[model samples]
Target chain A: KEDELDSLNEKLKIEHAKKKRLFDLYINGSYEVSELDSMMNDIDAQINYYEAQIEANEELKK
Target chain B: ELDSLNEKLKIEHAKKKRLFDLYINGSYEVSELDSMMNDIDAQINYYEAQIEANEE
Candidate 1:
């Protein structure tokens, strides 16, 4: 269970960092606004997915 | 729970370091980096507190 939570948290953190990098690329002109938005939405979905899993895991621990 | 928190703290620390590296490489503005770093710091603090409480 702890391992599950740890894995979820790690994935969540990686997703967040990916979003940050995407934003950086956008600001640096490597990506257009529409591209950034599309990629950001995808990354956000992953973040939310991992967050939900983490929440469920925490609930199970209680 | 303690182990999970500790692992989370480690991950956050690594994330922070990566953010700093990005900032240093001219990836973004100082304000943007500061905001992101602050967010990561909050997460680190939260996990630290949880680990501390669990150890008691």
Candidate 2:
């Protein structure tokens, strides 16, 4: 349990990197609209999954 | 449940709006993005907890 926080932070970094890349492509206009939309939906799902974990943990954090 | 649903939707809206503002303003920095992500994390947590509460 002690490493749980670190685990969270590390996972957070990976997701952050993913969104970073996605946003870069988005801003550069490198992707098609439909393509970007699809990618974002996928990215958001993963992010949303992690969010639930945080929600579960945050309550315990208090 | 509807109220929480709306609240969750509002947070999602806020996230996209913030993202748009940051991008349009060209204030894109890794630190700022990280900060935004942290906030999003907290918000999603809130919505999830509310949902959990309702379910229980």
DockQ of each: 0.04, 0.03
List, in the given order, the native-contact fraction of each candidate: 0.00, 0.00
User: What digit string (tens of lDDT, one per residue) describes model 2 on residues A1-62?
Assistant: 66457687677667667677667757766336775577678768877888888788878868
Q: How much does candidate 2 score in TM-score?
A: 0.45
Q: Which window of ten consecutive residues has the lowest lDDT sum in model 2 chain A?
A: A27-36
Inter-residue clash pairs, candidate 1 = none
What shift in Å separates residue A23 of candidate 1 from its native position after superposition?
1.1
Q: What lDDT score belongs to each candidate, Candidate 1 first?
A: 0.71, 0.67
Q: List model 2 lDDT by residue over B3-39, tens digit each.
A: 8576776777677556744543346764566567667
Candidate 1 lDDT tens digits, B16-56: 76775565345777568657867888988888888778756
Q: What is the TM-score of chain A alone in each candidate?
A: 0.83, 0.74
Q: Which 10-residue window of candidate 2 chain B scores lowest in summed lDDT?
A: B17-26
Index of the highest-TM-score prediction: 1
The lowest-lDDT stretch of 10 consecutive residues in candidate 1 chain A is: A27-36
